[PDB]
Design a protein around this ligand. Structure first.
Ligand code: HEM
Ligand code: HEM
Ligand code: HEM
Ligand code: HEM
Ligand code: HEM
Ligand SMILES: C/C=C(C)/C=C/C=C/[C@H](OC)[C@@H](C)[C@@H](OC)[C@@H](C)CCc1oc2c(O)c(OC)cc(OC)c2c(=O)c1C
Ligand SMILES: C/C=C(C)/C=C/C=C/[C@H](OC)[C@@H](C)[C@@H](OC)[C@@H](C)CCc1oc2c(O)c(OC)cc(OC)c2c(=O)c1C
Ligand code: FES
Ligand code: FES
Lengths: 179, 256, 428, 256, 428, 179
């Protein structure tokens, strides 16, 4: 053969390497800016949160729900058999990744009064309407019809998982610290 | 119009293989905080960049601690609070003190010879070197010329060029006769006004040289990134050129 | 590839210009192309689309001169364009309803095609290029709507970037990249501005090739019978020069359309839009009545028909070991509803071009048409019964029509007698 | 859900030849200032538009005077001052009171029949009509249903649709049985709460009807301009069409 | 019009695609056009320009995704693109020095033309279209520079919109309209953003026609002798197919250029710019050292040579009853310096194409070249003596060259013997 | 002839009329919006203005100079024959429009102490440098070399007129009101 057929490759080759090195940064520039990535954590004051009230707060640009549940609210949460849930995973970042969607496992406390979760429907993103609304006494996502129950578990609609619980924890008697 | 003298300091970052000195920047940051900060701000520099690589590179806990001294007004609440490292250094405290964010870039210290800019091509735009001079350019005595005719609230500076000059120091045509001119910035440095932890000398010479390297970085944080990017582009292309060359030569060979 | 006559330099300025750059020549061969004598009002939508693309682009540049793409000023900026900018209030509304007219036109244009076999060979490229233009139009129309930064703007931005979150595996990445962050925010609005600007020029570029393609294939008529290509003589029997015969017809039609269009823009500029977008964007509340833009409704209906508990969704979810669940199925169902339409040239197996001569086809076609209208209508109702059902059967008939019915009619159906020439049909 | 009843009012501006009533707007402006303004802002409405034609059309001296009643914070200084007419009505005073700037457009009062939007095509969106109803919609007595189960702090409204409803007023499926629901806005009006200069009646019926025509204009200032623009475009095109038609007809005449 | 063979469908995909839309065909006839065998390194600037236009446009869209056109955020926004955006610091610098390379290229490109008679018939259209492209380039390059909203940005914005204030009568109107107000403010910045975006697509469109024009005229060589058009045989003797002979030569050149270009962007990104633009725009101060962008210097020199006390200015002011004073004269002088160059096809009366064979021309040409460099150099000095004189003689020689010298050399000068064929020259 | 040749004009004509009606608003939208045209007047405090000092203030987006002149400054202004100035009009909006460029005619007081003018070079727009600079003891426009004298009169360069004086007047002992 020839070593000329090699050159016409070592060339076209080095070319394609440059073109790539060019294209990459033109793509990567769209990824999060050094400042968007610098976002950290926040602290929320739950002094006024009366039971039966939901507190909506902004964190990382998405809404975060903080409901202090009623007895009625906790009743139903605890009366659902795990296998009647559509999603079985707790989707809770505080507990193990394999935990089970048991109301008891979706609250911050043992009394299961403090439900803290991302008010971000898992279907496509809307913030589901609260106020003990929907078909399961939870939240209703108006975008495509997803219903969540009093523990924030998906129970009907396109949504595939339960509303996630973000790293949260009470750092004193009246303050939770998300993130 | 204008155009004066600037001390050509040999900075570590000057050069294609130049790189910031992690410690200088660190020292400089101290000078800026303990002296300059008093009047100048740095409103385009996010405090958290102190952590970012290729600069002072302080650990987050420090940076987080540092950012605490500033009293920022939260945009959502409206009420004041401690400064987070996601905050920008404050604005200039002293209303007529310029922002130092972009100073080493917004100044030229090397003006081409015949007005041909060939002096700048070989020495850079000399911004840090100019800021250096302005700091180490406050002589104790005005030039005998301005004796008594010293505008009040101003100080002579051997490097500053855009200041006012006493009528007595202008020649037959209006041109000033003094190497420098009158600034509104009282000489801020004076030997050992700052105490570096490791004892490194705090001679007004060193301090001014450090705040410069820092002020250089404050303005050009991706200096090193840019230069690494430079090399790469040059290798890719020095190779692609040689190859594209041979492919050319060994192709026209079948004609001429 | 029809037989007509080419450019003949007359004046001196023409002979001078011609021996250097034949811009005049080519523009002539373009404006004089022979086109079928029979062409009903359904052939005017191609022009209404061209005009819209131009209307949108100029009113756009103009609006971009006053709009600021930044979350804190964006909404305010548009209210300023409304109250302060000289005639802004009418330019804004023209750009907005321009999108609506743009789609009403592209659908009428599309269905015209489905019926007369304008996608059937040799026009298979015209169709795909047109199909790309369609995709671009929506992508654009979407980003535009995000700009005012209202309630619909913000959440539609949230939901549409969400569709890419549905993609298995890479999906979370594709989404973070589109958003430039962890949520629809300024970084998003800003990049959307830059792209809303850029896309229309890309469309314009395609419209050039779209035109080039049908120009180098000859137009189609309501007959499906091509123009006789064997002699300048009989070719002229089937045709008439585009200019001025059809430019006047088209411009005339374009005037009546615009008549009604301005009637809308002047008297009911807010009819076709959503009142909730006059509410500034709120990241912590999703409007209870959030509904898509009418021209998106049908594909929206299809996406939400497929919920967790749909038999076929269930089966797929099963045989996919979970990968294809309800969410991602609706995404695939929607995009597929479009991809299926892009493949019509290869699903409609009947060799008869015009459906005017396919008595069986005519029926499934009008059902398709009624389905699209129904689909659109459903997108606007809640997900409760009986809408969930109606939406389901409708989505079903859509794929039914392209994937099963058309392939079958191709083999079954007994075609009717199509005129032997355009000539004989025109004279009729 | 949220598709309720709204009182069709025959506004002067509804209609292709409709036009604002310079006096209504004027009255409305008084109601908004003496009642609504207390909680609701109009942040997108520049006070000087009060002078602009096609609206309330008050003379500059009044407008300049009016604007005085607001305590704006000057953007350059930062300190407070008198309100110039180049200023925008302030934000809503009451934090959960929505802005009324665009409110006449951000609400529909006529929702199509079969959900076909044909009711809106013939009656308009009904935004002013809806705001009208919300004002004239506070009945003296709650629906018998809510007896005793009324949320404290909210008030029943015969037109409002997106409010909370007592458990006792939802039927077997959750749907509310009452025509309206509970707003957080205590009924604003009450006969003659405002005294119009010329004595024109201040019945809660009239006042509400006026603030509406005003709020309509606050939102759509170029309504008349737009409509005149409409006509013109239609004439140009009704002619150009007829002509283009004949040119067409009398051209194909030489073929078919 | 050079004799050659054509594209023919080989594969099936090619025969399928060809009978529908010959995109492949046309792309072939374009990439295979026969071009003169002799073509020195001065013919590579056409490509370097194409590349720049693309480089500028992509890095532009990218930058537009992060920049906010509003006086209060505009400058900050660019510093953000520098410190936060992933690789922004290097994209910003590329766009900025991209402008420089873009001009260094267009000037080398232009002078190449002046010397070889590339503007002389039949290439007269290539020239005018190229001339329009040149005007657009500056208009663009200007608006771009306004966007960072620094000191030079603000005042250059003030001064350039001022040139329209010089136009007698209408001038104050033309200016208020450009500014959207009584001063360069946000309203201006905002509309400039929208136009800076739009113009490049217009340039792109012209470059299409610029290419189309020289493609349908055949390239020019350093000889001025055309390619023999009488036989595929002797045509091939003078030519060589563009691809791959010249694409490799051009791409190779383009690599060496880019090598140096990246060296600049990486190591001295700020060399070619003005330090004062890193100072936020101040409406109450004009920097003492305000100087234009280097690529504008020459036309800037010419404008300020003509002051109140220049003999012609006065003669002019006199005969023109005051109307044409010093201010408006400089404006006319500058724009005229460009308009004069656009007319070269009708001022250079010598019928000899290449100036390689015009011994008398060669001297005035290199003076023109030296004048342009001098002109550029002067724009950067103060208006004091002797610069005011140098600038004057220089501006003078510019018009001298196009308005007098070229027309005269046409009749005087004794030409040299140009090779009879490109072949004879190549072989040499 | 024909009445058909008329129609093909009555048509093309009505056409051109619409196109125009279209093009106009597309151009007119660039003119000053209702927000810019609403700008009125302002009041300046000259308390601190020492003689020899220049106050630069923004007004209508352009800078406005307020110099309290020295005796030296007023000396030179008065020592020039109107026929020696390039521009002869006072360009003073306060006095008659035909006034003459005599230092006395360009100051607000009779003492010639208060010089109030637009710091907008009449050549192309820059704000000329102050603090007695230039070759006429006035202002120097760094943009294209225009020199103005202690009275703000053009004396050299491309600038064709004297810096204009805007409607100004002292409304008390320490406050001038421009516009
Ligand atoms: C070592 C810390 C400091 C540094 C590096 C620094 C640097 C500078 C520089 C580079 C300039 C501008 C020179 C130019 O325009 O070319 C300046 C101006 C100024 N500085 Fe500082 N400065 C420092 C400390 C201070 C302090 C402590 C004050 C306040 C007491 C101050 C007040 C000013 C003022 C008022 C100006 C404006 C002077 C003029 O332009 O006339 N500076 N400084
Ligand atoms: C493919 C043609 C285009 C379509 C279908 C389109 C559609 C739209 C839509 C649906 C909106 C939102 C309506 C609203 O304002 O509520 C919009 C907004 C906007 N578009 Fe476009 N657009 C097109 C081309 C352009 C172009 C070429 C530009 C840039 C030159 C542009 C600039 C804008 C701007 C600035 C806005 C925001 C202001 C506004 O709300 O109108 N558009 N566009
Ligand atoms: C930018 C929007 C568009 C414009 C301006 C446009 C324009 C045109 C024009 C002028 C024609 C010729 C006249 C006619 O027969 O109607 C045409 C034909 C056609 N277009 Fe479009 N079109 C657009 C979008 C589309 C879309 C979305 C499709 C569907 C994918 C499409 C498919 C076709 C087909 C199949 C034909 C028939 C060509 C023939 O008869 O050979 N076009 N288009
Ligand atoms: C957008 C920047 C431009 C691009 C992309 C462009 C591109 C080209 C290309 C590719 C060629 C052929 C290769 C070569 O000769 O280098 C060319 C030739 C030429 N260009 Fe340009 N050009 C540009 C601007 C200009 C300008 C500003 C002028 C003069 C005002 C001009 C005048 C010419 C002429 C006279 C030719 C020779 C054509 C012939 O031989 O018939 N071009 N240009
Ligand atoms: C005709 C090719 C183009 C040229 C010659 C050009 C030139 C320029 C120049 C000289 C600047 C100032 C850069 C600086 O020194 O900071 C600039 C800025 C800018 N250009 Fe372009 N530009 C071009 C195309 C584009 C395109 C297609 C876009 C997309 C809209 C664009 C967007 C921008 C933006 C957003 C800025 C401001 C931020 C910055 O780059 O500093 N440019 N352009
Ligand atoms: C840079 C990023 C880009 C280019 C992203 C491009 C995506 C492009 C697609 O077009 C190709 C896409 C617009 C197209 O999908 C085929 C549409 C029919 C999407 C249909 C659509 O609209 C909604 C909408 O408008 C809303 O408003 C309030 C709200 C919505 O939920 C509540 C939806 C929605 O749920 C859906 C499915
Ligand atoms: C909406 C569209 C608009 C407004 C288009 C405007 C286009 C304008 C012209 O293009 C034709 C123009 C760019 C071109 O004239 C041929 C240049 C040679 C103008 C040269 C130019 O630059 C300056 C400059 O950059 C400055 O900044 C620091 C400052 C300046 O004063 C000192 C100037 C200046 O005195 C001149 C003459
Ligand atoms: S995003 Fe919640 S139902 Fe779709
Ligand atoms: S604008 Fe002042 S010298 Fe030209």
């Amino acid at each position: 053969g020839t070593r000329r057929d090699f050159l016409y490759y070592a060339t076209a080759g080095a070319g394609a390497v440059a073109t790539g090195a060019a294209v990459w940064p033109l793509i990567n520039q769209m990824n999060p800016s050094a400042d968007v990535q610098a976002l950290a954590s926040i602290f929320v004051d739950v002094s006024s949160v009366e039971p039966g009230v939901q507190l909506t707060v902004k964190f990382l640009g998405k809404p975060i729900f903080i409901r202090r549940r009623t007895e009625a609210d906790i009743e139903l949460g605890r009366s659902v058999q795990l296998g009647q849930l559509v999603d079985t995973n707790a989707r809770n970042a505080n507990i193990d990744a394999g935990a089970e969607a048991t109301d008891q496992n979706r609250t911050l406390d043992e009394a299961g009064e403090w439900l803290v979760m991302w008010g971000v429907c898992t279907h496509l993103g809307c913030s589901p309407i609260g106020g003990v609304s929907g078909d399961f006494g939870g939240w209703f996502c108006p975008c495509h019809g997803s219903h969540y129950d009093s523990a924030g578990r998906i129970r009907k609609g396109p949504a595939p998982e339960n509303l996630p619980i973000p790293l949260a924890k009470f750092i004193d008697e009246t303050t939770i610290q998300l993130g | 119009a204008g155009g004066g003298h600037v001390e050509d300091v040999p900075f570590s970052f000057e050069g294609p293989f130049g790189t910031f000195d992690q410690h200088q920047l660190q020292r400089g940051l101290q000078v800026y905080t303990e002296v300059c900060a008093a009047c100048h701000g740095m409103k385009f520099v996010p405090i958290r960049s102190l952590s970012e690589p290729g600069g002072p590179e302080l650990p987050e806990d420090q940076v987080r601690a540092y950012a605490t001294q500033f009293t920022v007004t939260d945009e959502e609440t409206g009420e004041d609070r401690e400064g987070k490292p996601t905050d920008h250094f404050p604005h200039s405290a002293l209303e007529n003190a310029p922002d130092l964010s972009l100073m080493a870039k917004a100044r030229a210290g090397f003006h081409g010879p015949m007005g041909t800019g060939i002096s700048q091509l070989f020495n850079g735009i000399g911004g840090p070197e100019y800021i250096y001079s302005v700091l180490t350019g406050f002589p104790e005595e005005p030039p005998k010329c301005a004796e008594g005719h010293e505008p009040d609230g101003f100080y002579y500076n051997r490097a500053f060029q855009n200041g006012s000059v006493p009528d007595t120091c202008k020649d037959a045509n209006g041109v000033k006769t003094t190497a420098g001119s009158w600034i509104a910035m009282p000489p801020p440095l004076m030997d050992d006004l700052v105490e570096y932890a490791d004892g490194h000398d705090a001679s007004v010479h060193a301090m001014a040289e450090d705040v410069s390297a820092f002020l250089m970085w404050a303005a050009e944080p991706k200096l090193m990134a840019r230069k690494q990017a430079g090399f790469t582009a040059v290798m890719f292309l020095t190779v692609l050129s040689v190859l594209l060359y041979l492919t050319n030569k060994r192709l026209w060979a079948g004609v001429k | 590839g029809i037989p007509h006559d080419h450019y003949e330099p007359r004046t001196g300025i023409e002979k001078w210009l011609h021996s250097r750059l034949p811009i005049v020549a080519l523009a002539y061969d373009t404006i004089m192309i022979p086109t079928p004598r029979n062409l009903n009002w359904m052939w005017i939508w191609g022009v209404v689309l061209a005009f819209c693309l131009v209307l949108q682009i100029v009113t756009g540049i103009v609006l971009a001169m006053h709009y600021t793409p930044h979350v804190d000023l964006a909404f305010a900026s548009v209210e300023h364009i409304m109250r302060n900018v000289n005639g802004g209030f009418m330019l804004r509304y023209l750009h907005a309803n321009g999108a609506s007219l743009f789609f009403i036109a592209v659908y009428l244009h599309i269905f015209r095609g489905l019926y007369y076999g304008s996608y059937k060979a040799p026009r298979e490229v015209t169709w795909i290029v047109g199909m790309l233009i369609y995709l671009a139009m929506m992508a654009t129309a979407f980003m535009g709507y995000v700009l005012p930064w209202g309630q619909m703007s913000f959440w539609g931005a949230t939901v549409i970037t969400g569709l890419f979150g549905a993609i298995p595996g890479i999906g979370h990445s594709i989404q973070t990249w589109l958003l430039g962050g962890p949520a629809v925010d300024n970084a998003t609005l800003n990049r959307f501005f830059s792209l809303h600007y850029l896309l229309p020029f890309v469309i314009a570029a395609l419209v050039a090739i779209h035109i080039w393609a049908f120009h180098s294939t000859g137009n189609n008529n309501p007959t499906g019978v091509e123009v006789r290509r064997t002699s300048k003589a009989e070719a002229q029997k089937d045709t008439v020069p585009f200019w001025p015969y059809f430019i006047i017809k088209d411009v005339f039609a374009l005037a009546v359309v615009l008549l009604v269009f301005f009637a809308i823009v002047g008297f009911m500029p807010n009819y076709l839009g959503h009142p909730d977008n006059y509410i500034e964007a709120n990241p912590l509340r999703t409007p209870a009545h959030i509904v898509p833009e009418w021209y998106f409704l049908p594909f929206y209906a299809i996406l939400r028909a497929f919920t967790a508990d749909v038999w076929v969704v269930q089966i797929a979810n099963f045989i996919s070991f979970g990968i294809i669940d309800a969410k991602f199925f609706g995404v695939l169902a929607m995009f597929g509803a479009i991809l299926v339409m892009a493949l019509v040239p290869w699903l409609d197996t009947s060799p008869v071009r015009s459906g005017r001569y396919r008595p069986m086809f005519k029926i499934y076609f009008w059902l398709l048409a009624a389905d699209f209208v129904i689909l659109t209508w459903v997108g606007a109702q809640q997900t409760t019964f009986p809408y969930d059902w109606i939406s389901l059967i409708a989505s079903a008939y859509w794929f039914a029509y392209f994937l099963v019915i058309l392939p079958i009619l191709g083999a079954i159906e007994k075609p009717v007698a199509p005129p032997a020439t355009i000539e004989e049909d025109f004279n009729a």
